[PDB]
Write a protein that binds this ligand. Sequence first.
Ligand SMILES: Nc1ncnc2c1ncn2[C@@H]1O[C@H](COP(=O)(O)OP(=O)(O)OP(=O)(O)O)[C@@H](O)[C@H]1O
Ligand SMILES: Nc1ncnc2c1ncn2[C@@H]1O[C@H](COP(=O)(O)OP(=O)(O)OP(=O)(O)O)[C@@H](O)[C@H]1O
Ligand SMILES: [Mg+2]
Ligand SMILES: [Mg+2]
Lengths: 226, 226, 411, 393
Amino acid sequence: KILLQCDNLCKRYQEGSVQTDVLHNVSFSVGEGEMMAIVGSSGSGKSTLLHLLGGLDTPTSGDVIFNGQPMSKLSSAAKAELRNQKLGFIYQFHHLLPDFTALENVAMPLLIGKKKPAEINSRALEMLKAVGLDHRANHRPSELSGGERQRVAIARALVNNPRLVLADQPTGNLDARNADSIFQLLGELNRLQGTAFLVVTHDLQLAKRMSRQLEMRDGRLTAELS
Amino acid sequence: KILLQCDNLCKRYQEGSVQTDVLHNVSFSVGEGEMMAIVGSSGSGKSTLLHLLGGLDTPTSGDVIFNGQPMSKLSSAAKAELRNQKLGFIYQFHHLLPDFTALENVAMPLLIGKKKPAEINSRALEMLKAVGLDHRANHRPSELSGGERQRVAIARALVNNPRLVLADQPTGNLDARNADSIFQLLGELNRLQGTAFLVVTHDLQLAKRMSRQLEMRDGRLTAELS
Amino acid sequence: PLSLLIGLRFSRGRRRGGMVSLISVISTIGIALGVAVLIVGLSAMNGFERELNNRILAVVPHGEIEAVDQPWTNWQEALDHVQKVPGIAAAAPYINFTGLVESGANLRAIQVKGVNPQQEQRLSALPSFVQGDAWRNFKAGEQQIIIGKGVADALKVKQGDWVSIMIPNSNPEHKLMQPKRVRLHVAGILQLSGQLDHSFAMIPLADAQQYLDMGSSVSGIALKMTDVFNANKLVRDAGEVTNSYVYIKSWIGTYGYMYRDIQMIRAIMYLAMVLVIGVACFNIVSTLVMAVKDKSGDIAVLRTLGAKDGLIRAIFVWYGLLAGLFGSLCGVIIGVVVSLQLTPIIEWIEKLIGHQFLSSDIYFIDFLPSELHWLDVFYVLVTALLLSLLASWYPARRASNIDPARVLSGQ
Amino acid sequence: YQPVALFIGLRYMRGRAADRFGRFVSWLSTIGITLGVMALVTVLSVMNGFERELQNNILGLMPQAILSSEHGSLNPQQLPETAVKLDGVNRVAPITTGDVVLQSARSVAVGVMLGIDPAQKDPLTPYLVNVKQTDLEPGKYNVILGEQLASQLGVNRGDQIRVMVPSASQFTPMGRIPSQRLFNVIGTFAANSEVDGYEMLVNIEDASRLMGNITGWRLWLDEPLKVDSLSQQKLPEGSKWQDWRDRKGELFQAVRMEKNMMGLLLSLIVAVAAFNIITSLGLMVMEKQGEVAILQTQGLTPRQIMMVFMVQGASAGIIGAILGAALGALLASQLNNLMPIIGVLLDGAALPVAIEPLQVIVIALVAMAIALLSTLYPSWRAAATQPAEALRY
Ligand SMILES: Nc1ncnc2c1ncn2[C@@H]1O[C@H](COP(=O)(O)OP(=O)(O)OP(=O)(O)O)[C@@H](O)[C@H]1O
Ligand SMILES: Nc1ncnc2c1ncn2[C@@H]1O[C@H](COP(=O)(O)OP(=O)(O)OP(=O)(O)O)[C@@H](O)[C@H]1O
Ligand SMILES: [Mg+2]
Ligand SMILES: [Mg+2]
């Protein structure tokens, strides 16, 4: 079965008289519990595609179907719920709230989901230990390093046990060992919770661990090349 | 040879009467034209050390001497001159002025240096083309991508032909091809003008192209372990 | 220049911004509003201050010197002995008494003041431009004389009607006797106001000498000065040369309660003006502080590239001038228009609202008088420009003195 | 905790700070609200204090209003004391007023007659000195004068005063003799007011008038400045209705002008203060447009974002209003003892009341409502932008 489908997805940018288009009828489908890599060149259009599939932007030339529900014909009272439980998102620059601690940052989607308290701390600490951040659970994002500021976002995406995780470069600020550990964690999560992963990566080595690879040369999702 | 020398400097943090020590007696030295790599695990303290060497933070112990002049005891005008004419810096998160264009961002160090406007635009355009960003000179940082923003920061660092470049993960958000091209450009710059490149990198195979490969762990600069 | 370029880019920074950003328009209409309310308040204060001088101080005379109830003709040097103290604009000998006016069984008590033939209008502005009546042509003969319009309540008279006059003896002895009740011809009516022009009449000093018995002695003196609220000092000072008995009361002494009320009113108005100045200057400094606090990150980035503190100072004084000059100019443009030609009568009902806020409460007209000074406007512009420069300067240097790595990280 | 909106709103206040100046930028809105509220309450207190002080000290001795009846020496037989039905009436007592010329052994002056029953208590009673309001027998023609007047014309205890009534004059074809009487002063009287200059009192029953005298009716006013609305009244032929504005007319004009100017200055203060609250909170909402993008990414309903920003606005406004009310009350109560306005005018003082229930309460509530309403639109505008669009900056 399929989980997230997009077809004829075109996005163009126009602020002044100058036009700049980034996508050319991108069409692909992701099934449940599926590894996937969207490795590609810089400036190709990987991040904007991820924004479009997540419902955080308007494609204006197509539609994205999530679990049979198109994203355009969705009320704000329903988009929020989908975005809170069914889908998790990791930004490329790991946008964190710079007034909460790391523990509160990881536990924020659990608070938003109206979960009953006194185990929110347990799940947040479990995820912070899983990404390897037990000793930095009281530091604000301003007091965190760039490498471990990314792990907070990674844990925040995975703390709610979603169905599909859209990761935008979850590796670029990490070393090889931490990247390997986090990819093992993602594989373990797929094995147990069955969560599909759509990861945009620049590291070609760990991209081979992904079940499927795409290219996105110049805004078109080609099958495979280099 | 020598150009920059660290005299047993160490850094601690007081996060509200709580001590979290981050550095332990760093006493390494670098010559002129020596391309250096620092490698370490995430959260070890590479970026704090790089900030300390550039004069952007207080060492709270020891001192950093630039070819005979300590950075602790220096006039504000002299510090600004040093930072503008003979020291380039690449931030890990490429802080660029958001209201200016890419060309204006790259040309900004030349404008502060009081150069002739005829050559400023030519030099900025040449440096923008060097990182392969010719087709985005009119784009604001909000209209650029992660890789393009990183390349703009790299071009801004090298646009003034400094004697020493402090790079903090210059190829974090780049693919393999662009990272290889950037490192090649760094090599050509080192061979032509003789500028030392103190680069912090998370990539191991790309760090093998350096003269010395110091590994920094737990606030200490080990000779070589991994 | 580079600093002006950076300041203008900061002004138009938000997105494309069209012409200017949200921070720019919010920071430039606060200055305009402050300047407008400042000049409006100062114009209203000047308009009220003119009213007190015209309607209260000019109406009543200041100071006196009384006689020893004996024939005292040696007073011709008084007009030469009032210029010893500077500030005495004019002086005029005068006489006062009381009487009755009869016209159709409408007797009314009237105090009557005798004035100098030539100094009746230079001494004070009261009997000068009331109605342009048949004054300044009385002579010693032609005893027809002027009275206020408000005295003709039960009396129906005009410029030529005849009335009766009752006078007392006022002999120079220990006590008083029966009144003489010597009648006289009086004709002529003026109009000044409704408060003083109720039971007040006017007589010459020339015709007061005959049918009287003090031997052409002018008992009282009159004075006018500039320091009206300080006038107690100069009245005593000018009375150094006098007869054996001298009284040094003035408008302050005779009307102490009215003077106290006037001083209280002035103090309250000055307190309210100080409050307006304090409030209308806070929204200027506060809004410009937030802009620089927002731009602190770009200040750090500029300091990283090697920008000297002089460059940042120039950038932010240009930023303050751009946010201040346009705002102050718009402020004076709107304020001078709304103060010189105030919105006369369009105040009845405001725009339709879902819930009316405190309807049928106390409603007051804003201001009838307003004086254009064209000098306090310059002071308001100077203080607005100075405050705009000062507000966008201290946070600039405060952010410039921090290490770039700390502030750029978000600390 | 469970109310996530309240938690985020409380955490948005009490920011990172870590500096003396860092707290100032976060507390700018609270400081502005406090300044506006304090200025409003202290200026209202000063205004009300002046109005009350002038009202008491001037119109607590002179008749605020009186009717007229001169036909037949009218008694309440035509209409009892309950004849007046106008609003703002609190008490009515008999009175008799008119201009009278007083001749002494050495001087002649003028005054106004006051008719006060010995049994009836008048507002001028407590200021009597050395006398106990006695000797005002109907049979005796005893005269009460004023201290200022008595010093002015030189009359003390044990003297005689000739009384002439110009209004009550019998016109005949011999002379022009008005009503003439001889009164004896058998007491010392005083009052600390302007009215002491010409106050003088007698019994109502006297033959001072032609006919055996006119009988007015003193009418106390709950609002002595309401007199502009004295149009609704009834009176018989040959008489009229009178107000306190017949005397001190320039005082009434000055009071009206001062009230108008104070109202204008109040409007200016409100206009400046309301603008500062509206813009500062809107800019605080607009500045954190990236935070709401992250919250919407995590799954926050726009209603929840509106609640977050409304909670922050309320938390700022309540503290600002309370601090402003406290500071304004303290400044009003200490405008003279502390002497903050050192450059005080000569013989000039400011009198406050700082009345609580109707002045310092509604202002704070209006300020809090303005703080609430200023936040709603910017939060709605920020919640409409796409999360990936706002986060690009
Ligand atoms: N106020 C603070 N400023 C900076 N680092 C702090 C502070 N308080 C605690 N720390 C911790 O000190 C360490 C310093 O690490 P640093 O910021 O230099 O990054 P790093 O080791 O180069 O990491 P990476 O390259 O993976 O981002 C981190 O673990 C950080 O969480
Ligand atoms: N608002 C915009 N106006 C114009 N061009 C834009 C706009 N937003 C994005 N672009 C361009 O469209 C392309 C899409 O960039 P995108 O962020 O998808 O790249 P990327 O592959 O993720 O980058 P990186 O390698 O830096 O991570 C880029 O070339 C970018 O410059
Ligand atoms: Mg991207
Ligand atoms: Mg780092």
